[PDB]
Design a protein around this nucleic acid. Sequence first.
DNA 1: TCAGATTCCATTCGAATCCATTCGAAAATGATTACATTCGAATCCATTCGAAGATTCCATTTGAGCCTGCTCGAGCAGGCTCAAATGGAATCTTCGAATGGATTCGAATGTAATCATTTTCG
DNA 2: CGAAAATGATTACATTCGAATCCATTCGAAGATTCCATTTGAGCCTGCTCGAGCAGGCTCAAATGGAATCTTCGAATGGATTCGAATGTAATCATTTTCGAATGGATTCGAATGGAATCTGATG
Lengths: 94, 85, 79, 78, 90, 96, 90, 89
Amino acid sequence: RYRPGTVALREIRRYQKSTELLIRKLPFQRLVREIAQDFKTDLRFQSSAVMALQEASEAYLVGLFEDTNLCAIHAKRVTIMPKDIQLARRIRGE
Amino acid sequence: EIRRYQKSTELLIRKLPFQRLVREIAQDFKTDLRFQSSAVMALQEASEAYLVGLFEDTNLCAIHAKRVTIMPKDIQLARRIRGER
Amino acid sequence: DNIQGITKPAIRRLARRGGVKRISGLIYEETRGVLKVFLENVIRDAVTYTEHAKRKTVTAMDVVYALKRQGRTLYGFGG
Amino acid sequence: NIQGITKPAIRRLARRGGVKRISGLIYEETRGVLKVFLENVIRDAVTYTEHAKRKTVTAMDVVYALKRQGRTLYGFGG
Amino acid sequence: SRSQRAGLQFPVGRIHRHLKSRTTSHGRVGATAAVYSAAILEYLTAEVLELAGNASKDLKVKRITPRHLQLAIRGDEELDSLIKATIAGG
Amino acid sequence: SRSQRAGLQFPVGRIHRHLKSRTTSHGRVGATAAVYSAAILEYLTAEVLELAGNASKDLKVKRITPRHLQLAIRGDEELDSLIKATIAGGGVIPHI
Amino acid sequence: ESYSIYVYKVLKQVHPDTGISSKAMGIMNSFVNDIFERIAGEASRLAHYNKRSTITSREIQTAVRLLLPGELAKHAVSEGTKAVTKYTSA
Amino acid sequence: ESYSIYVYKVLKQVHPDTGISSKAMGIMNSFVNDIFERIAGEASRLAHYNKRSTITSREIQTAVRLLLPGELAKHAVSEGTKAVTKYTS
DNA sequence: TCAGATTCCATTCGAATCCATTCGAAAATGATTACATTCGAATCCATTCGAAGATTCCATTTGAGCCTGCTCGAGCAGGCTCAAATGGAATCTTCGAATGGATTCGAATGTAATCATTTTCG
DNA sequence: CGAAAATGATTACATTCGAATCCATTCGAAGATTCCATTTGAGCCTGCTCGAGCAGGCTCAAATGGAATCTTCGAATGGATTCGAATGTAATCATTTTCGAATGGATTCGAATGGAATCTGATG
């Protein structure tokens, strides 16, 4: 066995060392098409459009999690909670 | 006193010290500079607005940590999330 | 229910790349909500761009222009 | 000249922001952040002044500098 | 005039000239772009002025001041999103 | 050519033509505005590429990839301030 | 030149009993100029993206859709379309 | 049209033994286009502020000083001034 | 001290970069205008500088009470491990929809003179 | 409330420019078939968060000095702003040539696999 926090740091190093995408592509494409159904019916997407959307969204989420970790450390914790997400998004004017 | 200064529209800083500080800061970019009074008034309005908004964010940060007193760490967190630090 | 295809492991990986050591149990629904809002904004702008050009296909340049409009410029897909 | 911005003035600005209590080390931090902001804006104002071959800083230069900074202001000719 | 033909108070010829003086290269401007722009500007002006006047009347006064404008803008979510400027004197 | 007179690698005539294409109303563009702009673009390109090449040499790799561009940009304060865009395939800076 | 004449006309239309000061009038002029510059720039970009040369009411409509928040863009679009139709019919 | 030729010339000037991929080339193209569009817009606005029609190297210098941070602006101004002086000689 | 994880040294190869050829596209050369910028004067505003004074903000000390930080135990929620189920990727195959380029061609914008307002300043 | 220098509005072309039809090609969508890697519960345990009671710190308020901001007055001057004239130079035709973009082809540098040696972590 490993103590709680060992594998966590291992994966932190692993995913801060790589450059790949961390979300599966078929679910994201389905979600994108379902969202776009509300604006116009019978739309077609280039593969490059969905790839661009995935890159942008992953970058957004990683930056948000960095701000959330800062908020968590401010309150003397290591666990991130929804209140940290809300505070970070509020200071960002979102 | 919070209600007194939140319900007014005046300027909360004295004009002469702000004018002196503005001229001293500006002398690092060009010597023998002149100013309109409107330029200093605009600078004062903008700076007071900036400080009030930053203090609102700082109060949010103070409440996040279960306090009512604001500390420099709250200013630092607010400015880092804003993008200034 | 296509937002439940953004699974727990995927969000955990996205949090690990952000340096997050421990995670609550209520973080995943919050993340799904914020992702939905962001995607709605960007896709709305992109579809406006395709509609102006009298097209039926959403291209990568519409996405790039929309992102630049939101203030989230992206390099590597044109421009 | 940064000490001419007194602690009662900082207290008033904090009260207008909804702040109930203040630490004693907040005034120096406030002076530092105000100095940084003022330098950032005045740099651009003097750049605009020098392009026009003038020796006087006008309100339009400040308005343009703020608009560049992302801090648009209404009521000074722009 | 063109404004009376469209049924507006804002000027169509002046806005057309201003639009022409802002197109890149040798660009042209249609005569209905000016009508659309004048309609949009008049609509937004009327919305802001209506909210500000309601605020002023609720204060039992006869004029509009920058404080009334700030109260009107900050109390509306749409006008808050659109207008992020600092109002001098508000 | 004009670029050889100025002593540059970037094109002065093409940049002049683009500048003329991006002027509001009836706008003229001088011949030295293009020289200045080409010099600025070449300088910024050289700075970014030098940092990225140093990063590439650090990991014993001959070629430059978007990872090296990201590492170069995020490790420099001025480049980080100037370039706020997202780089497709750059990852993040490892920092626990 | 300014927009004081037309702002005053619109104010008399919406609040016939209410006046306006001069600082508020200056703030309103700044607001009108801000909105006009935003719309004009976005319309020019839209025309350039499509390799077109003329700015038309379609560019203005798309700019209004992209710049204004929802439920504020719908009424603006309606007012602009009505103005253009009334202008063309006469 | 692209900038690949001149970017590769600059690269072979700086690092004469390292190459570049095609994704990195696309990213470099996007970077150059982004900065060029920013400078052009700023110069046009500066020309309009003073009620002038021609865009000169003074507008470019002011735009560079307004858009670039810190020592980047100083070194860029030096390089552009040197280029213009060598050209006009 | 032992089981996992991490990094490094060998081998081959196939995905990718760098080099070599033809070419329409565009840049440089050479007069010619006009068009825009620059260089003197001449008012003429608008900033700095000085002086004064009651007042109205600011400064310092004390002290009490309120707030924050610290110790400690309890519990609870998150992490790690493992076995089973599922669904993504990937590699073709076919087709069915839709860009994008040409060729007319009909719609509409800008320029030229003369008013007839009209907005801006007393 | 009045006057008058800008400046839209009208009539009339000239000619770009933006639309309507057609033809091909990309390319995007819909089926199909696996291995297998990723996800999903479930259990067990541990360390992390949280609440309560103390203990120490330190903020707000009040009173008394005291000090420096704010408004008015007025010269003095300097520095923006307008008016002509005189150049400086950028844009426009007309050729001619060179260069950069697309197409092919020869290395060759990144990319699996396959062990091997440490490095690290955890319980004894």
